[PDB]
Structures are given as structure tokens and as C-alpha cells.
């Protein structure tokens, strides 16, 4: 199924995201660690975050929201996860399922563009 490949790509980026948020080795050798650290340091200093119109915060929110549904830690390292878990425990309570029942709202190859074609000089 294409949903398994989609879940695998999203899980690649979610593991890279939680890794990047807990990575005390900052100038790390992992490829997606450095890609996630760029967008995490960006959004922490941003003023147009998803609610406004920022595409990098919105694209980071897509993977952080997919992550937060499954995450169960008291104080997880991901910046948006805590906020998303609080609103989801208030609204949904029971979280989300697996594979065929997941946050399938995005393309798995497009997540690889979100960290390559993001806002900057040209
Ligand atoms: Zn790292
Ligand atoms: Zn932003
Ligand atoms: Zn989390």
C-alpha cells in the first residue's frame, strides 16, 4: 500500500525531528537532524507562524502534529508537540490509530521539499 510508504517517510522525518530537538551534539552528522534544527531554530524566532502565513512553520507543524498524536511523554523535546498534545487531550482525548488510520493530510515526497525549497535568498 502507498500509505505504508507514506507512514515510513513521515516516521523518518518524525524520528529526525525528535532527534534534532534532543540532539546535544548540534553540528551532528545525520542529514535530517540538520534539516530539522534549521526549521526549529527558525520557528522559535518567527512572527508569521502557520496562523499568519509562514510556509516553513506550517510544514514543520504537519510533521509535529502527526508526531504529537502518538507521543505520550510528560515533557517531550519537540517545541510544538507539548501544545498539540494539550489541545488534543482536551479535544480528542483518545489520540489516533496506525497506518490506514493516521494524519494522511500530506505527501511523503513533499516533506523532502519542505526542508530544501523553504524561504531564503536566491
Ligand atoms: Zn543530531
Ligand atoms: Zn516561520
Ligand atoms: Zn512528542
Swiss-Prot record:
The modification Phosphoserine is found at residue 1. A zinc finger (TAZ-type) spans 3-84. It is found in: Cytoplasm; Nucleus. Methylation of the KIX domain by CARM1 blocks association with CREB. This results in the blockade of CREB signaling, and in activation of apoptotic response. Part of a complex composed of MSX3, CREBBP/CBP AND EP300/p300; the interaction with MSX3 decreases histone acetylation activity. Interacts with DHX9 (via N-terminus); this interaction mediates association with RNA polymerase II holoenzyme and stimulates CREB-dependent transcriptional activation. Interacts (via transactivation domain and C-terminus) with PCNA; the interaction occurs on chromatin in UV-irradiated damaged cells. Found in a complex containing NCOA2; NCOA3; IKKA; IKKB and IKBKG. Probably part of a complex with HIF1A and EP300. The TAZ-type 1 domain interacts with HIF1A. Acetylates histones, giving a specific tag for transcriptional activation. Mediates acetylation of histone H3 at 'Lys-18' and 'Lys-27' (H3K18ac and H3K27ac, respectively). Also acetylates non-histone proteins, like DDX21, FBL, IRF2, MAFG, NCOA3, POLR1E/PAF53 and FOXO1. Binds specifically to phosphorylated CREB and enhances its transcriptional activity toward cAMP-responsive genes. Acts as a coactivator of ALX1. Acts as a circadian transcriptional coactivator which enhances the activity of the circadian transcriptional activators: NPAS2-BMAL1 and CLOCK-BMAL1 heterodimers. This is Histone lysine acetyltransferase CREBBP. It comes from Mus musculus (Mouse). The chain holds residues 1764 to 1855 of 2441 of the full protein.
Amino acid at each position: 500500500s502507498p500509505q505504508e510508504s507514506r507512514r515510513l517517510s513521515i516516521q523518518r522525518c518524525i524520528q529526525s525531528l525528535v532527534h534534532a530537538c534532543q540532539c546535544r551534539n548540534a553540528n551532528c552528522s545525520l542529514p535530517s537532524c540538520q534539516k530539522m534544527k534549521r526549521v526549529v531554530q527558525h520557528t522559535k524566532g518567527c512572527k508569521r507562524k502557520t496562523n499568519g502565513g509562514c510556509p516553513v512553520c506550517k510544514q514543520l507543524i504537519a510533521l509535529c502534529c502527526y508526531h504529537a498524536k502518538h507521543c505520550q511523554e510528560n515533557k517531550c523535546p519537540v517545541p510544538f508537540c507539548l501544545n498539540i498534545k494539550h489541545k488534543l487531550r482536551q479535544q480528542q482525548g483518545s489520540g489516533s490509530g496506525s497506518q490506514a488510520m493516521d494524519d494522511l493530510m500530506l505527501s511523503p515526497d513533499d516533506i523532502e521539499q519542505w526542508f530544501t525549497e523553504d524561504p531564503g535568498p536566491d
